[PDB]
DNA sequence: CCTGCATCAGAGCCCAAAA
DNA sequence: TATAATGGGAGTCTGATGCAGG
RNA sequence: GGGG
């Protein structure tokens, strides 16, 4: 079908490769595809050049190389294995002593290589590091809560690279500095800088009463050495201040360009705040034996002028997105490989003093351990390493774009208020309003801005059009938060004829604020709506139709639709859809010009200009992180014709190349006889009778056959007392056949364990002796289903030790893996939900004669509750139905860009063409209007919906413009009393299915200590109990009901035990006794040297331990 | 009125102890006491 | 006598919780 | 069981209460 | 990080 395109905005550039984010900043700290030489300092070459040289003998640093991966990124999936790299690197030994140089290349371990679309393979599983927002590095002055006429200077370096600075200035005049939360007074550290009473007077002195508060004679009656002892003490107590341990600590803390560390950012911002130059990234140097400043007097002229009130001098706002900065993979990465670093050269001087100072090399010099477990432990465990969210292509785009203001270095939960959360007004087209979690995380969890790109020292860009005069240039510059503020920039939508600005009147921002200014004040201009929201944000239409909680949710739930088999793009899209798909690199694309020579199922082969036969094979069915199917499928032909960038595969929950989350269906809205309560939804059976809104899903079954100090476990055929209709679909070696359905309670992996001394009781021995059958050496261990799951055997895969290749974890035989695959129809209390927020559980499925359906005869497919929309204030998803409408008759979809969309007349032209399709076919059919149509149209006349006094059909075409059709009720034939809103809406099954969700348990395992049902389905738990619900219980006063609660349905031992032996003999359970974690309680308080008694009315001790702990 | 305030905080220990019968001396500890062991357990998890 | 000032103990529920 | 070796490395915000101090 |  055609698709018919809106807007009158030309976007001047297409939106950034949006995995950039990830993919620069991770090449750029490793720089492997670099010549050495040619490496700038930066990433893993700068952490190298920054730990060495190692002195004492001296060991020196040349050059690290990185190898290519041992095995491929499909083999490292397979293997529970981590894609990565061996680094080398290439030291030289020096003896200060000597002379002697040796010279190897020794081996660091692996690091782990980030694939094509911005992730990382860790121990076989797909991972994602998320970016981290905080302040910036540099020099900040806020105003002193306390003292409202004062102010503190604070210095922030990098975080872990130095200590926090406050320069309050005390109620008694001078000028007072903290660090590690100790204050002194500031003069004295100036004076180990070797500034005498003059410097202060003469650089300073103009603020009368300030600068003559900082001196103070007692420490200038020192030369700058006996200041510094002085200082020593007031920070160590108790250590002796030699000279050259004083030297040594307060150089490691306020000059060693190795412990302290300002950013790259920290040195821009402090240059130009204080108009000063950085010489390095310290506060101070050590230079001609002395100490020589560089900030600390800057930093306080700037104090004292900002006090005193002198021009140019302000408060810094600590959430602008100048002031803040995004930490990213590979700065993030830096600085774990820094931590590591650093433990390994403790190793090297350690060796240095040690085992003869001669006969070292630099290969037995260093152990890599440090730095394997540095890197290994960032990867496998930190807070911004998080499993990758593979549900659909969208929803690992959108992860890889997040950003997050936890993690470490950041904010806690417990640890975070206001002035953070909210949408700054810097957040314009850098971070998006909309897109963040909502509940306890709201806005510390963001979402790049479509257009915004992260430069070089962390700040994050975003794209303006240069306006000159009035002619608007396509020269785009990126700018930062800081520099945007100097300019009066003009809104995307501002009219223009050809170049030039065609208003006289303007709608502009300087500072974020709102103003309306002459064409001649326009210096730049936003170059898109889409550069203010993220890219989920992006994907609903008609949003500036719709209030912004709910905008959120459609945005969020987009990455949880899961991939169907029959999925389809909405047939109104807002133009985004088509660059999703290619960035996300789900399906695939014709590197160069070319014919197809072959097309599969399994691949697809493509003969280019150049004569080479390039093979392109497809992912079939794969098991994603969370169980949906990533599958491609082949969509070209043999001999087919294809330029550069074609597709030739579709990827999962993509259409053609557009993103395709849902289906589209044809919706009435309308209450149904309370199935529609409360945002429950009902559905037609034509949905599953055809197919829609069903999914492919995966669940993985693992099991380990291992050594015992009782002897091997094996995986056999051979598993006792089992008949043979049990192990039918059974291989030889006891493995389930491939292709075979497997239901709850069926073995899928064979296994016999050898018995423990519970080698059987006397009981049993004289049972078995009656029989005749020996009591087996194994016992029945066999992995089975659990309750609820079960699907189709599609593969198996088995790893034993001794096999070409694999080596388990110490003690494990063998190894395997059987995975399951289940087709889900849509069912009742399965969730679907469209792009705007209107989300709901399936109530109920009606059989097509029952659905309300058009006079022509075609029942409707979903029918959604019109309550949901006023309080809702989503009212995009009205207006994607009606244009809808006009799309199902004249077969179309359409691009509504977002802000720059379908307007209401455009829409209205729109449906008055389809009505001649709906209406102009039944007139020359030889039909006229029918009866129930007129008494609809009567009570639309009471209603002021049609004008009284036309011809029936231009009433039903007035009705037809306002998006209402005649509704015939499927039960009684009736019309409905009125005309009803009928359309096409795009509506997605998202990941929560009851098929997961549903859990019951009637006994089961139990926790050590306590005795208590274990927690959650997939351990068979009981549901907690707790401490409202408990509440709940009492004020009603049901005490027998939860005294149950309390002992029999938990951890009373005898009660519970006795309770189920009476309910299958059909006594009443039994009155409750001493529940076990009391007990637990009470022998807790013992071991903390309390004696809890347990007394009789008459002060007795009673016991209830029932004799066993009393000698 | 400060000395008849700490005078009582204080008496109010000594009056605790007096009333329950134990010995201040017990504040201090001669023998520790340790926990039963199926308390504080050492297991074999799945994997051996 | 009274007031700064520190050290301490608080910060919702249930479910997945992908180790 | 024996050259001599002699002092360490490292990280929010609220309200209530019991304390050394103009 | 995700559901109400
Ligand atoms: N205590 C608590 N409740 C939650 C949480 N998350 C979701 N809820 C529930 O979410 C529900 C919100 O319901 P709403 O749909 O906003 O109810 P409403 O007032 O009718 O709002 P509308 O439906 O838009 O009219 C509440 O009833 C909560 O019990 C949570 O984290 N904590």
Redesign the interface.
């Known amino acids: 079908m055609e698709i018919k395109r809106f807007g009158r905005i030309r976007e001047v550039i297409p939106l950034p490769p949006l995995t950039e984010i990830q993919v620069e900043s991770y090449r750029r700290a490793l720089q492997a595809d670099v010549p050495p030489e040619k490496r700038e300092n930066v990433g893993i070459q700068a952490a190298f050049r920054e730990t060495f040289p190692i002195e004492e003998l001296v060991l020196d640093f040349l050059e690290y190389r990185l190898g290519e991966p041992p095995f491929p990124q499909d083999e490292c999936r397979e293997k529970d294995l981590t894609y990565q790299a061996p680094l080398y690197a290439r030291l030289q030994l020096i003896h200060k002593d000597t002379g002697l140089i040796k010279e190897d290349e020794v081996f660091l371990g692996h690091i782990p290589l980030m694939t094509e679309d911005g992730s990382f393979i860790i121990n076989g599983a797909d991972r994602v590091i998320v970016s981290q927002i905080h302040r910036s590095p540099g020099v900040y002055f806020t105003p002193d809560p306390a003292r409202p006429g004062r102010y503190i200077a604070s210095i922030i370096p990098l975080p872990k690279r130095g200590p926090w600075i406050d320069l309050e200035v005390e109620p008694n005049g001078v000028v007072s500095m903290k660090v590690n939360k100790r204050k002194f007074p500031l003069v004295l550290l100036l004076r180990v800088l070797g500034y005498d009473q003059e410097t202060l007077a003469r650089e300073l002195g103009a603020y009368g009463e300030l600068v003559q508060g900082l001196m103070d004679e007692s420490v200038f009656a020192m030369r700058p050495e006996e200041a510094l002892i002085r200082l020593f003490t007031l920070l160590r107590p108790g250590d002796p201040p030699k000279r050259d341990k004083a030297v040594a600590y307060v150089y490691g803390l306020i000059a060693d360009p190795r412990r302290y560390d300002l950013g790259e950012a920290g040195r821009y911002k402090a240059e130009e705040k204080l108009g000063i130059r950085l010489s390095g990234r310290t506060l101070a140097r050590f230079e001609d034996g002395e100490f020589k400043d560089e900030v600390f007097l800057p930093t306080l002229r700037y104090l004292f002028a900002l006090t005193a009130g002198v021009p140019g001098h302000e408060v810094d706002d600590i959430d602008h997105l100048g002031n803040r900065r995004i930490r990213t993979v590979g700065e993030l990465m830096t600085d774990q490989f820094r931590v590591g670093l650093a433990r390994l050269a403790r190793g090297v001087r350690e060796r240095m003093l040690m085992g003869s100072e001669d006969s070292l090399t630099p290969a037995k010099l260093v152990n890599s351990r440090p730095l394997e477990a540095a890197i290994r432990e960032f990867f496998s465990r930190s807070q911004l390493s998080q499993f990758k969210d593979e549900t659909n292509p969208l929803s690992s785009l959108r992860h890889k774009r997040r950003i997050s203001a936890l993690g470490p270095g950041g904010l806690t939960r417990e640890r975070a208020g206001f002035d953070v959360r909210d949408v700054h007004r810097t957040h314009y087209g850098r971070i998006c309003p909309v897109e963040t979690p909502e509940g306890a995380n709201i806005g510390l969890i963001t979402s790049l801005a479509a257009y915004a790109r992260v430069d070089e020292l962390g700040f994050i860009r975003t794209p303006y059009r240069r306006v000159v005069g009035g002619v608007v240039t396509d020269e785009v510059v990126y700018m930062t938060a800081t520099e945007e503020d100097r300019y009066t920039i003009a809104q995307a939508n501002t009219p223009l004829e050809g170049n030039r600005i065609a208003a006289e009147r303007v709608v502009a921002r300087r500072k974020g604020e709102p103003v309306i200014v002459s064409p001649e004040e326009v210096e730049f201009m936003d170059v898109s709506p889409k550069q203010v929201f993220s890219v989920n944000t992006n994907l609903i239409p008609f949003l500036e139709h719709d209030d912004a909680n709910r905008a959120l949710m459609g945005s969020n739930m987009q990455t949880q639709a899961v991939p169907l088999i029959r999925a389809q793009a909405p047939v109104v899209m807002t133009g985004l859809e088509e660059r999703v798909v290619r960035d996300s690199l789900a399906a695939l694309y014709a590197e160069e010009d070319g014919e197809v020579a072959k097309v599969d199922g399994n691949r697809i082969v493509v003969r280019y200009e150049d004569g080479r036969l390039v093979e392109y094979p497809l992912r079939r069915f794969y098991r994603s992180n969370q169980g949906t199917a990533l599958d491609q499928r082949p969509r070209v032909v043999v001999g087919q014709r294809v330029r550069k960038g074609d597709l030739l595969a579709d990827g999962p929950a993509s259409e053609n190349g557009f993103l395709a989350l849902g289906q589209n269906v044809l919706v009435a809205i309308m209450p149904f006889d309370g199935y529609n309560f409360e945002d429950a939804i009902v559905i037609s059976e034509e949905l599953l009778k055809r197919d829609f809104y069903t999914s492919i899903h995966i669940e993985r079954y693992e099991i ?1 056959a ?1 050594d ?1 100090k009782l002897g091997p476990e094996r995986i056999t055929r051979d598993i006792p007392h089992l008949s043979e209709a049990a192990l039918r679909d059974l291989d030889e070696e006891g493995v389930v056949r491939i292709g075979a359905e497997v239901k709850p309670g069926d073995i899928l992996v064979g296994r016999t364990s050898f018995k423990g001394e519970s080698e059987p009781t006397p009981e049993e021995r004289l049972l078995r002796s009656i029989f005749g059958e020996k009591a087996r050496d194994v016992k029945d261990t066999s992995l089975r289903v659990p309750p609820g799951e079960g699907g189709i055997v599609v593969r198996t895969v088995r790893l034993r030790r001794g096999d070409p290749g694999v080596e388990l ?1 110490p ?2 035989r063998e190894v395997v893996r059987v995975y399951v695959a289940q087709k889900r129809k849509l069912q009742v209390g399965d969730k679907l939900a469209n792009r705007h927020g209107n989300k709901g559980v399936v109530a109920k499925i009606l059989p097509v004669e029952d659905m309300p359906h058009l006079p022509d005869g075609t029942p409707v497919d979903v029918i959604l509750n019109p309550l949901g929309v006023p309080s809702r204030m989503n009212l995009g998803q009205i207006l994607e139905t009606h244009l809808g409408l006009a799309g199902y008759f004249l077969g179309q979809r359409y691009i509504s860009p977002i802000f720059d969309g379908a307007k209401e007349p455009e829409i209205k032209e729109l449906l008055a063409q389809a009505f001649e399709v709906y209406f102009g076919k039944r007139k020359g059919e030889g039909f006229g209007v029918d009866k129930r149509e007129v008494e609809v149209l009567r009570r639309a006349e009471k209603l002021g919906l049609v004008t009284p006094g036309k011809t029936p059909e231009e009433q039903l075409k007035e009705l037809f413009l306002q998006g209402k059709v005649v509704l015939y009720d499927g039960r009684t034939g009736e019309p409905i009393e009125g005309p009803i809103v009928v359309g096409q809406m795009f509506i997605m099954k998202l990941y929560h299915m009851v098929e997961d969700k549903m859990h019951a348990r009637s006994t089961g395992p139990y926790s ?2 306590t005795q208590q049902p274990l927690g959650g389905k997939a351990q068979f738990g009981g549901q907690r109990f707790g401490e409202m619900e408990v509440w709940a219980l009492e004020a009603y006063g049901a005490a027998h009901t939860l005294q149950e609660m309390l002992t029999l349905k938990s951890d009373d031992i005898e009660g519970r035990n006795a309770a189920y032996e009476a309910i299958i003999k059909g006594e009443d359970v039994p009155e409750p006794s001493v529940p076990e974690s009391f007990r ?1 309680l009470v ?2 308080l ?4 309390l004696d809890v008694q347990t007394l009789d009315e008459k002060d007795n001790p009673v016991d209830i331990f029932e004799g066993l702990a009393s000698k | 009125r400060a000395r008849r305030a700490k005078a009582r905080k204080r008496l109010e220990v000594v009056r605790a102890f007096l009333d329950s019968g134990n010995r201040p001396e017990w504040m201090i500890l001669e023998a520790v006491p340790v926990l039963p062991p199926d308390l504080r357990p050492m297991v074999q998890v799945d994997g051996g």
Request: proline fraction near 0%; charged fraction near 35%.
């Open positions: 380990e291992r015992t974890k003690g494990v050590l200590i637990v022998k807790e013992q071991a903390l040297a």
